């Protein structure tokens, strides 16, 4: 092989859980198998498979299908979370305006390559999206205050609480999110973080650009470790006890 190709985040994580799985196996455990049965009850049948996969030469069709799953599970993890960073307004905007997909929207407005990417970003070249962008008096806008624009019209494409709890499932910022359960969508730091909390592990990403990586983990949960440059090429720490 060549890892000069790239390595999405989904296929780092994928391997990652492969290998937590195969090691639980050898102290007579499934727990986090389990665990991704309770997250997707479609991968159950797939376990003497993920046991028999091959780490240093792993199967691309089983490493898709887990790799499908995880982008199943990270999509419906951030429209939960969407949802009530929505409905549960705080009289403040602002978790709204912190969090991942709400970000990337507003990226749109902006118009920058490296942060409107089709690969890292789900709502990158949705036409109706870019339809309601392109009719905004950018000058208007003071600067600073974009998010008076950009969160009522991202409320407005979800119709997000003040509603019901259900946004609209023609919603353009649903439909803009269904690209993440797509192939040319590889995910970034952002999507791995709600599958963390999903899976329950600590997630490590070393990006080698400090001497120093410090990361905050809790005992209890195995540890994932990943590598990431510039998002198109991770790598996966795996690990055997002797």
Not at 71 to 97: A, P
Request: glycine residues 4%; hydrophobic residues 35%.
């Amino acid at each position: 092989d060549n890892p000069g190709l790239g390595n999405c985040a989904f296929y780092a994580f994928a391997i990652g859980l492969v290998n937590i799985i195969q090691e639980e196996a050898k102290y007579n455990r499934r727990t986090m198998f389990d665990r991704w049965v309770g997250l997707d009850r479609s991968i159950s049948g797939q376990y003497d498979e993920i046991l028999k996969l091959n780490l240093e030469d792993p199967d691309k069709e089983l490493l898709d299908r887990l790799q499908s799953s995880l982008r199943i599970v990270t999509y419906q993890y951030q429209i939960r979370e969407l949802r009530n960073v929505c409905v549960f307004r705080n009289g403040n905007y602002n978790r709204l305006t912190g969090n991942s997909n709400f970000v990337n929207f507003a990226a749109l407005y902006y118009g920058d390559p490296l942060d409107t990417d089709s690969r890292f970003n789900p709502f990158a070249d949705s036409v109706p999206i870019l339809i309601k962008m392109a009719n905004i008096d950018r000058d208007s806008v003071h600067p600073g205050h974009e998010n008076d624009v950009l969160v009522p019209l991202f409320l407005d494409l979800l119709y997000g609480d003040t509603l019901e709890t259900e946004p609209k499932s023609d919603s353009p910022i649903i439909t803009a999110m269904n690209n993440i359960t797509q192939d040319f969508f590889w995910g970034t730091h952002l999507d791995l973080n709600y599958l963390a909390e999903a899976f329950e592990v600590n997630l490590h990403v070393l990006r080698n650009n400090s001497p120093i990586q410090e990361f905050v983990d809790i005992p209890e949960r195995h540890t994932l470790t990943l590598t990431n440059s510039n998002n198109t090429h991770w790598t996966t720490q795996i690990t055997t006890a002797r």
